[PDB]
Write an enzyme that holds these catalytic residues in place. Structure first.
Site, PDB file in Angstrom:
ATOM      1  N   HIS A  98       1.023   1.499  -5.800  1.00 12.27           N
ATOM      2  CA  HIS A  98      -0.280   0.843  -5.804  1.00 12.27           C
ATOM      3  C   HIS A  98      -1.356   1.796  -6.352  1.00 12.27           C
ATOM      4  O   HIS A  98      -2.126   1.385  -7.218  1.00 12.27           O
ATOM      5  CB  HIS A  98      -0.657   0.409  -4.377  1.00 12.27           C
ATOM      6  CG  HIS A  98      -2.075  -0.026  -4.272  1.00 12.27           C
ATOM      7  ND1 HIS A  98      -2.583  -1.033  -5.075  1.00 12.27           N
ATOM      8  CD2 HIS A  98      -3.074   0.478  -3.509  1.00 12.27           C
ATOM      9  CE1 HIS A  98      -3.857  -1.149  -4.752  1.00 12.27           C
ATOM     10  NE2 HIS A  98      -4.213  -0.236  -3.836  1.00 12.27           N
TER      11      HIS A  98
ATOM     12  N   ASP B 220      -8.873  -1.964  -7.624  1.00  9.58           N
ATOM     13  CA  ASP B 220      -8.252  -2.451  -6.378  1.00  9.58           C
ATOM     14  C   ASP B 220      -7.844  -3.952  -6.380  1.00  9.58           C
ATOM     15  O   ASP B 220      -6.813  -4.306  -5.797  1.00  9.58           O
ATOM     16  CB  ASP B 220      -9.159  -2.148  -5.190  1.00  9.58           C
ATOM     17  CG  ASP B 220      -8.483  -1.450  -4.029  1.00  9.58           C
ATOM     18  OD1 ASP B 220      -7.257  -1.192  -4.113  1.00  9.58           O
ATOM     19  OD2 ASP B 220      -9.181  -1.121  -3.062  1.00  9.58           O
TER      20      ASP B 220
ATOM     21  N   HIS C 158      -7.386   6.924  -2.793  1.00  9.88           N
ATOM     22  CA  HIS C 158      -8.147   5.837  -2.193  1.00  9.88           C
ATOM     23  C   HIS C 158      -7.446   5.073  -1.037  1.00  9.88           C
ATOM     24  O   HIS C 158      -8.156   4.398  -0.314  1.00  9.88           O
ATOM     25  CB  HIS C 158      -8.709   4.864  -3.246  1.00  9.88           C
ATOM     26  CG  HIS C 158      -7.831   3.704  -3.560  1.00  9.88           C
ATOM     27  ND1 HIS C 158      -6.854   3.791  -4.520  1.00  9.88           N
ATOM     28  CD2 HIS C 158      -7.827   2.453  -3.038  1.00  9.88           C
ATOM     29  CE1 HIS C 158      -6.298   2.590  -4.573  1.00  9.88           C
ATOM     30  NE2 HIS C 158      -6.845   1.758  -3.695  1.00  9.88           N
ATOM     31  N   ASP C 159      -6.103   5.189  -0.857  1.00  6.34           N
ATOM     32  CA  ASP C 159      -5.370   4.543   0.237  1.00  6.34           C
ATOM     33  C   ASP C 159      -4.467   5.475   1.015  1.00  6.34           C
ATOM     34  O   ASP C 159      -3.509   4.985   1.618  1.00  6.34           O
ATOM     35  CB  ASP C 159      -4.569   3.319  -0.271  1.00  6.34           C
ATOM     36  CG  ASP C 159      -5.405   2.073  -0.431  1.00  6.34           C
ATOM     37  OD1 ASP C 159      -6.332   1.876   0.381  1.00  6.34           O
ATOM     38  OD2 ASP C 159      -5.087   1.247  -1.340  1.00  6.34           O
TER      39      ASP C 159
ATOM     40  N   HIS D 116       0.798  -1.225   0.000  1.00  9.64           N
ATOM     41  CA  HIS D 116       0.000   0.000   0.000  1.00  9.64           C
ATOM     42  C   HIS D 116       0.851   1.307   0.000  1.00  9.64           C
ATOM     43  O   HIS D 116       0.691   2.192   0.858  1.00  9.64           O
ATOM     44  CB  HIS D 116      -1.000  -0.041   1.146  1.00  9.64           C
ATOM     45  CG  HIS D 116      -2.127  -0.993   0.925  1.00  9.64           C
ATOM     46  ND1 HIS D 116      -2.209  -2.179   1.619  1.00  9.64           N
ATOM     47  CD2 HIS D 116      -3.192  -0.897   0.096  1.00  9.64           C
ATOM     48  CE1 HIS D 116      -3.309  -2.769   1.192  1.00  9.64           C
ATOM     49  NE2 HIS D 116      -3.938  -2.031   0.284  1.00  9.64           N
TER      50      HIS D 116
HETATM   51  O1  LIG Z   1      -0.951 -14.501  -2.425  1.00  8.01           O
HETATM   52  C1  LIG Z   1      -1.193 -14.116  -1.288  1.00  8.01           C
HETATM   53  N1  LIG Z   1      -0.318 -14.017  -0.275  1.00  8.01           N
HETATM   54  C2  LIG Z   1      -0.934 -13.530   0.953  1.00  8.01           C
HETATM   55  C3  LIG Z   1      -2.316 -13.086   0.488  1.00  8.01           C
HETATM   56  N2  LIG Z   1      -2.425 -13.707  -0.834  1.00  8.01           N
HETATM   57  C4  LIG Z   1      -3.678 -13.696  -1.611  1.00  8.01           C
HETATM   58  C5  LIG Z   1      -4.377 -12.352  -1.606  1.00  8.01           C
HETATM   59  O2  LIG Z   1      -3.731 -11.514  -2.578  1.00  8.01           O
HETATM   60  C6  LIG Z   1      -4.129 -10.207  -2.697  1.00  8.01           C
HETATM   61  C7  LIG Z   1      -4.979  -9.580  -1.796  1.00  8.01           C
HETATM   62  C8  LIG Z   1      -5.221  -8.211  -1.887  1.00  8.01           C
HETATM   63  C9  LIG Z   1      -6.186  -7.567  -0.959  1.00  8.01           C
HETATM   64  N3  LIG Z   1      -6.738  -8.351  -0.099  1.00  8.01           N
HETATM   65  N4  LIG Z   1      -7.684  -7.841   0.770  1.00  8.01           N
HETATM   66  C10 LIG Z   1      -8.586  -8.858   1.348  1.00  8.01           C
HETATM   67  C11 LIG Z   1      -9.686  -9.345   0.324  1.00  8.01           C
HETATM   68  C12 LIG Z   1     -10.553 -10.565   0.635  1.00  8.01           C
HETATM   69  C13 LIG Z   1      -9.854 -11.914   0.500  1.00  8.01           C
HETATM   70  C14 LIG Z   1      -8.743 -12.237   1.492  1.00  8.01           C
HETATM   71  C15 LIG Z   1      -7.540 -11.299   1.504  1.00  8.01           C
HETATM   72  C16 LIG Z   1      -7.783  -9.931   2.145  1.00  8.01           C
HETATM   73  C17 LIG Z   1      -7.839  -6.519   1.058  1.00  8.01           C
HETATM   74  O3  LIG Z   1      -8.710  -6.111   1.808  1.00  8.01           O
HETATM   75  C18 LIG Z   1      -6.859  -5.595   0.354  1.00  8.01           C
HETATM   76  C19 LIG Z   1      -7.347  -4.137   0.336  1.00  8.01           C
HETATM   77  C20 LIG Z   1      -8.393  -3.913  -0.712  1.00  8.01           C
HETATM   78  C21 LIG Z   1      -8.478  -4.640  -1.812  1.00  8.01           C
HETATM   79  C22 LIG Z   1      -7.748  -5.942  -2.014  1.00  8.01           C
HETATM   80  C23 LIG Z   1      -6.536  -6.096  -1.078  1.00  8.01           C
HETATM   81  C24 LIG Z   1      -4.569  -7.467  -2.874  1.00  8.01           C
HETATM   82  C25 LIG Z   1      -3.692  -8.074  -3.760  1.00  8.01           C
HETATM   83  C26 LIG Z   1      -3.448  -9.439  -3.670  1.00  8.01           C
HETATM   84  O4  LIG Z   1      -2.596 -10.136  -4.501  1.00  8.01           O
HETATM   85  C27 LIG Z   1      -1.829  -9.411  -5.487  1.00  8.01           C
HETATM   86  C28 LIG Z   1      -1.582 -10.279  -6.695  1.00  8.01           C
HETATM   87  O5  LIG Z   1      -2.790 -10.644  -7.336  1.00  8.01           O
HETATM   88 MG   LIG Z   2      -7.703   0.363   0.837  1.00  9.15          MG
HETATM   89 ZN   LIG Z   3      -6.061   0.015  -2.713  1.00 10.89          ZN
END
Ligand SMILES: O=C1NCCN1CCOc1cc(C2=NN(C3CCCCCC3)C(=O)[C@@H]3CC=CC[C@H]23)ccc1OCCO
Ligand SMILES: [Mg+2]
Ligand SMILES: [Zn+2]
Length: 329
Positions: free
Chosen positions: A86, A236, A122-123, A82
């Site tokens: 991003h 996002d 937004h962040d 973040h």
């Molecule tokens: O491979 C991984 N290693 C550890 C986590 N993991 C898989 C999750 O990967 C990603 C998760 C995120 C975000 N996760 N979550 C939540 C969403 C609901 C599902 C569970 C995870 C938490 C957020 O709240 C963040 C803020 C807003 C939008 C999306 C962001 C962003 C980018 C991610 O991957 C980037 C390459 O595609």
């Molecule tokens: Mg955010």
């Molecule tokens: Zn964001």
């Protein structure tokens, strides 16, 4: 205020041989091929927005737009995911949704301008800690949220800082608007930022799909706002829709940030979820596949089939990346 060395260090950057409007745009390479990645990141947003002709249409001068981007940049922290890159990435990606995926037809020009601006705010001031961290630890921001009754701890915080940057006439990108237009610009930005809280993911997605059961009405305030919210949300969770090399680099960044949160939770004696556990270890491929299957793939597929037909590539690329992560295992 901004120093003139700071403004000129960004102003002098041009991209004649690198298309910043492309769906294959590689921000990691743009960062890695300079000794000034924060200046290049700010110039990508600046040139992308000036190149569109949108700020000029809403009375946002080159200086004000540049001041605004630099004020946003100052409020982004040195965290693995973040950080300023991003939001520049989200801005660039939403641009492609609008103008390569033809979503601009579903929104007014003003709303396209507001969306691109919103991506950059937004962040604001994210510390690499999620909403749950603030609440579990009873942090001042968590306490503030609880007492005020607004559960989206960070998202309200992001809005407060956006309003603060915009309160300065020298960085008010909406300063050139009046009446209904100006109210719409602030209202839409605030609503879009509030829509980014993933605890509300299925709420926003299902509010949108039900509105699209009947014909798309641009005269309807709710139709346009829900489309704006869905695009902010799509930007996002768009790292899954990029080329595998790019998608993998965002995967590594979010992993490291999440692991740092987990380490801080372990040090504080608060609950740690497996996704945030550094010492114990889960394969990057597994995290991404789970993320795609239960969140990213149904989101893109449903919005594409319901109204956003031009965004079909997002569905395609997510599947191709899901298949590649399966091979990694
Ligand atoms: O491979 C991984 N290693 C550890 C986590 N993991 C898989 C999750 O990967 C990603 C998760 C995120 C975000 N996760 N979550 C939540 C969403 C609901 C599902 C569970 C995870 C938490 C957020 O709240 C963040 C803020 C807003 C939008 C999306 C962001 C962003 C980018 C991610 O991957 C980037 C390459 O595609
Ligand atoms: Mg955010
Ligand atoms: Zn964001």
């Amino acid at each position: 205020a901004i120093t003139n060395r700071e403004r000129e260090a960004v102003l002098r950057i041009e991209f004649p041989n690198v298309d910043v409007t492309d769906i294959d745009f590689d921000l990691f390479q743009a960062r890695e091929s300079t000794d000034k990645p924060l200046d290049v990141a700010a110039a990508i947003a600046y040139r992308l927005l000036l190149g569109s002709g949108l700020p000029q249409k809403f009375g946002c001068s080159d200086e004000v737009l540049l001041n605004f981007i630099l004020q946003c940049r100052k409020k982004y922290r040195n965290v693995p995911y973040h950080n300023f890159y991003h939001v520049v990435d989200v801005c660039q990606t939403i641009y492609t949704f609008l103008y390569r995926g033809n979503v601009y037809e579903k929104l007014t020009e003003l709303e396209c301008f507001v969306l691109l601006i919103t991506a950059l705010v937004h962040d604001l001031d994210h510390m690499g800690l999620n909403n749950s961290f603030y609440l579990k630890t009873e942090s001042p921001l968590g306490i503030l949220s609880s007492a005020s009754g607004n559960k989206s701890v960070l998202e309200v915080h992001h809005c407060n800082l956006a309003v603060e940057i915009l309160s300065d006439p020298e960085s008010d990108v909406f300063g050139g608007l009046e009446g209904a237009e100006r109210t719409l610009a602030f209202r839409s930005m605030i609503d879009c930022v509030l829509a980014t809280d993933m605890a509300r993911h299925s709420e926003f997605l299902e509010k949108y799909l039900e509105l699209m059961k009947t014909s798309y009405n641009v005269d309807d305030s709710d139709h346009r706002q829900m489309t704006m919210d869905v695009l902010m949300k799509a930007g996002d969770i768009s790292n899954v829709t990029k080329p595998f090399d790019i998608s993998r680099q965002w995967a590594m960044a979010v992993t490291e940030e999440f692991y740092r949160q987990g380490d801080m939770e372990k040090e504080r004696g608060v609950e740690v979820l497996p996704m945030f556990d550094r010492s114990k270890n889960m394969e990057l491929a597994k995290g991404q596949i789970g993320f795609i299957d239960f969140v990213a793939a149904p989101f893109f597929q449903k919005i594409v089939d319901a109204c956003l037909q031009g965004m079909q590539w997002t569905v395609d690329r997510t599947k191709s990346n899901r298949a590649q992560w399966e091979r990694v295992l």
